[PDB]
Each structure stands twice: as structure tokens, then as C-alpha cells.
Design a binder for this molecule. Sequence first.
Ligand SMILES: *CCC(=O)N(c1ccc([C@H](C)OC)cc1)[C@@H](C(=O)Nc1ccc(OC)cc1C)c1cccnc1
Ligand SMILES: *CCC(=O)N(c1ccc([C@H](C)OC)cc1)[C@@H](C(=O)Nc1ccc(OC)cc1C)c1cccnc1
Lengths: 304, 304
Amino acid sequence: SGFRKMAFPSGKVEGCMVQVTCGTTTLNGLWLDDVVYCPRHVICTSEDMLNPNYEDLLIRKSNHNFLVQAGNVQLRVIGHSMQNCVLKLKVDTANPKTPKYKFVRIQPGQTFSVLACYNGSPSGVYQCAMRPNFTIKGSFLNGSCGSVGFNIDYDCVSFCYMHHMELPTGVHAGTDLEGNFYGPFVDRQTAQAAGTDTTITVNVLAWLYAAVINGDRWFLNRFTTTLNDFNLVAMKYNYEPLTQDHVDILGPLSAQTGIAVLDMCASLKELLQNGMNGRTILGSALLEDEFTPFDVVRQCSGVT
Amino acid sequence: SGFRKMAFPSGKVEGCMVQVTCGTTTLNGLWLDDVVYCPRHVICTSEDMLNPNYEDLLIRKSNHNFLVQAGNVQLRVIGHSMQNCVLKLKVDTANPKTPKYKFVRIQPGQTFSVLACYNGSPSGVYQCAMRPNFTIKGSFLNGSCGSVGFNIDYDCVSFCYMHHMELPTGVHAGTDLEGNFYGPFVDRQTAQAAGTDTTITVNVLAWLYAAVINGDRWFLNRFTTTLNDFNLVAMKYNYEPLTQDHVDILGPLSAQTGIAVLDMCASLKELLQNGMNGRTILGSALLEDEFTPFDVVRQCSGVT
Ligand SMILES: *CCC(=O)N(c1ccc([C@H](C)OC)cc1)[C@@H](C(=O)Nc1ccc(OC)cc1C)c1cccnc1
Ligand SMILES: *CCC(=O)N(c1ccc([C@H](C)OC)cc1)[C@@H](C(=O)Nc1ccc(OC)cc1C)c1cccnc1
């Protein structure tokens, strides 16, 4: 029993964090095999962040300008390239701690763990979600760029995110490990507003199933709804539309608890229309949307 | 910017998790040097959990009855002893991954990370706090016993908790690494009610400072209070009394934000008396009490 905002164990990812310096800028890099991945803005002069032309800036850099440090030992940079908004620094040594890995680009609503790092050293780990506006509500300070977001299936680390920047609204933007940003964000110091932060409906539904499994049942009502009816209510409350795919994905939780997905939607619809009335669900006073149906099943069954 | 419920990186602790089996019971153990620490209830027959006499049960066990497995390899048990409610299984091999460590007994209000494990394998990591009633609101299922709670100062892991049991109210009880339980809990299947779960006032104050640092300032008011006045209000709302030590501990946050501790107490007093009025603080609709002043400073400054 009990439901915590749980992150994957970070050990496998800790073994990949290195420090990357270019000139006087220092950020984190991800060392997998003989390649160090880092944000390309490491090459920017701190007084040309408004309008950088990365291809031009990169002409002034050589392999020897990128200082890669794993722990207290220096790695030899034998090659460098720019792929979208990341730099790939080929080193002369394969990381002896490289776990089994994949690079995956996630969809909004999907969750992941972030290992926040400063100067190649991990300082903390927490759970995140790719928001429907392609931002992440992370916890990052200056020098956290290059920290990665990941998921783990048994022994395989699926790298999904690398931190690049903070939007003026205190939210975060970054790329997948191929250097492509999530959403419309660009690695430049410019006016970039985030879009509407809608609630991830399927995740709220999953967390209501987690609450039922763990004993919190006061919100279970006598009503049901249809996908179209619920979606009208969800639209009004800036919730993501619920699709038949989400219903199918919620199937195992519906089966375990005996509560039909559409009955839980009606329970959610009443919580939206009436509020919590001073009550709590899994120790929270708001509807939690950063647990996917997969995370709920994993946590509630103990997938290691 | 951004404030997440952050846990310490778990890698150092992952390298210590082993599987411990006695008869047909399987739980987790902590392997530090040539010793494996686990809850003593591993020796209980699943049909003598109501009234166990551990000294008597232990007479029927030998070194060869405790099966310790690190990964897929078996460790040789050359000795076994009972210290309070933990068993110390001396093995013939020192753990090659043993980090720098200490065993510390924490006070209520103190926070720590938990690496939830099943069959010696870590499945997740999350942040916890020792509640003022000596329970922890963890996330543990059957077979999670032996999972540990810890803090890390640079390279030193301070082990503070080992999970032993779930109280009927879905909350959790466990020991420090010397086998002494936090609170009045006993390792037996009996009627054990938790006490009042009061709110950790100093931690709420610290998290209000974290909110001010990160931009959420709507709750800052024009009032101040005294320690005695605030404590009357705190008493009414089942909040821990605020002492002068807590004020001193909040000193660095008070200095960084320019908000005197007693002014923040008056801000808290108004939040208690009036509620959030539908508003949020750091993405939360309730007053968060599981961030110590130390955790706020660490997170806000980036201590790795
Ligand atoms: C790793 C460097 C860093 O911390 N930041 C950063 C990132 C990118 C640049 C520019 C875009 O590339 C040359 C500079 C610095 C922080 C950051 O993104 N800062 C920032 C905040 C707000 C605005 O508004 C226009 C612009 C910028 C660049 C950063 C701080 C905290 C957390 N994550 C990143
Ligand atoms: C590791 C074993 C386990 O999961 N549990 C457990 C722990 C201790 C015993 C007894 C006390 O010692 C022989 C048996 C099992 C779970 C647990 O504590 N179960 C439990 C729940 C409620 C009550 O009410 C009286 C009693 C017991 C024993 C456990 C489940 C989930 C999380 N953590 C522990």
C-alpha cells in the first residue's frame, strides 16, 4: 500500500554523467559507448545567446576545445559533430559503465525520471512528464543543461530527454537524444511562450485507479458517462480529450478494480464540477496527472 | 527554477541490495562490507507472525539456512547474529561496491530517500519523511521489507531506515540500521495504531521559502506573529510546535529571501485559517511538509 511519486533507480544513468566544458561554459554530458552527448549551446559565448548561428560558432571549435571530464579523469576527444541541437563528442574510450540503452522520442502525457546534474555530478532524481504543451515542469538551475530524462525496462535505459533551457515562466524545454526539441522551442534567448498546460486526463484516470487500489474511495460515485459527454466536461476544464486508445490502455486497471473506465470518468467529471470539498486523494489536494496507467500498474505490482 | 520532490541518486545504494531468503520467505538485504543487514522477520513461518519469539525461532536456523544472493551469484554466509530487530549475516566476501557509509537514527521531521526493492532488485526511488508519529508514508508492497532509507553527503551514504512492516492504516514502520524501530512499533502481526499525524511546521515554512524563491508569492501577507501566537494556531491545526531551534535553522532561507521567519509564520497562520481559496503553491493544493530547510537550500543551490 501507499502511492509515491516514484522515479526509476538512477545508478545506470549516474554511470554516464560527465562534465563538458567549451571555453568558459560548463554543462553536463551523457557518455554512452565512445560518444558524449551534450546541448550544442555549450559553444555559446554568454554574450551571443540572443541570435546564435551554431554552424558558424562551431567552425571556431576543434576537438581539443571540448573538455570532457568523467569523475576526476579527462577523456580524449577524437571527433565532434552537431546533430540537430546536440553535440556528439566522439571520445577515445568507450564508457565502461554504459548500460543497455535506446534513444526514444516520447509523446506528451508520457512520464520519465530526470537525474539532475551539475558539473557532471548527479545531485537528485525526480519523476517528470512531457506536458501537453511540450514543456516539462522540472527542477533545474543554471548549469543543469545536459541532464537527462529516462525510462528503464528491466536492464535497458530508454533515454528520452536532455535538458536545454528554462522558459521565462520557470518551465523547461529540451530535446530528445537525437537533438530534436520537444515542441516548438529553439536553443536561443528569445521570447518563447509555452502553450496551454492542459491536464493529462488518461493519467488522472490512472491515478484515480491507483487511489481505489490503495483505499481512497470517497470519490467513487453512482454515475457513469460516455466518451463524448465526458469530453465536453474535460474541454471546459482544460483537460486533454479522452480517446478510445486511452480507455483500452486503462483496461488492466479497470479489470483489477472492477470499476468500468466510463464510471471512473463520471467520478472525475464530478470532481471537476464540484472540487475536492477540502478532501484529499492519495495525500493530494488536486488531481494528479503525472502517473501514466503503466506507472500505476508498475508501482502497484512491484515491477523491478 | 522549479521545485520537485527530489530524491538522492540511488546508484550507491543499488550496489548494496541483495536478496535474503530463509525457508520460503524472501526479502531484501543491505550488503555493506562483509555483512548483510535484513529484518529479523525473514525467519518467521508465515503462520506464527502473531506471537513470534525471535530468540527461539533463531535457534532452529544455521548460517546455511540464510540464502543471500547478490545479482545472480550466491554469497557464503559464515556467521549470523540478531541485533534488536535486524539480522546481520556475515558473508565471506566484502561488497566490492560498498560506498562510504554511516548508520544514523533520524528524528521526526527529517527526510530521506527510499530505494524500494523486491527480491534484491531496486524498482523505484522516492523521497520520504519520518512522520511525527514515527511512521513513514511510503510506497511498499509485500516483499519490500529490507528496503532502506538514506541520505547522502557528497560520497557518504547515511543509512537511516530499513522497512519492516505495513500498519493496518496503510502507513509504514521500520527500524534504523541498528535494528531499533522508529516509534513504538514491534515486528509482530498485532493491533498497532499510529498516533496523530501532525504537520512538520518547520518543513512547511521551509517549503514556503522555496515557493518565494521560485516565484509563488501570492501568500505573502502584511502580517507578522510571535512564536507563542503562531504556536496557538499551529496547535489548533495539528501542526508541530515551532521552537527557536527551527527559527535558527530557517535563518539561511530567511536571509536569502529577505522575509523574517516570524513574518512567514504569519503567512502560514493565514493559510491555515483561510485555506488556499482554490490557489496552488509550487503546483500543490496543500501545505507540503516533507522538505526540510536543508533540502530546500540543497535543491535551490544545486548541492551535488
Ligand atoms: C545550462 C545553461 C543554463 O542553465 N541555462 C541556459 C540555457 C541556454 C542558454 C541559451 C539559450 O543558449 C546559448 C543559456 C543559458 C538556463 C536558461 O535556459 N536560461 C534562460 C532563462 C530564461 C530565458 O528567457 C528568455 C532565457 C534563458 C537562456 C537554465 C537555467 C535554469 C534551468 N535550466 C536552464
Ligand atoms: C516483507 C514482508 C511484508 O511485505 N510484510 C510483512 C512484514 C512483517 C510481517 C510480520 C510482522 O513479521 C513476521 C509479515 C509480513 C507486510 C506487512 O507488514 N503486512 C502486514 C500488514 C498489516 C498488518 O496488520 C496487523 C500486519 C502485517 C504483518 C508488508 C506489506 C506491504 C508493505 N510493507 C510490508
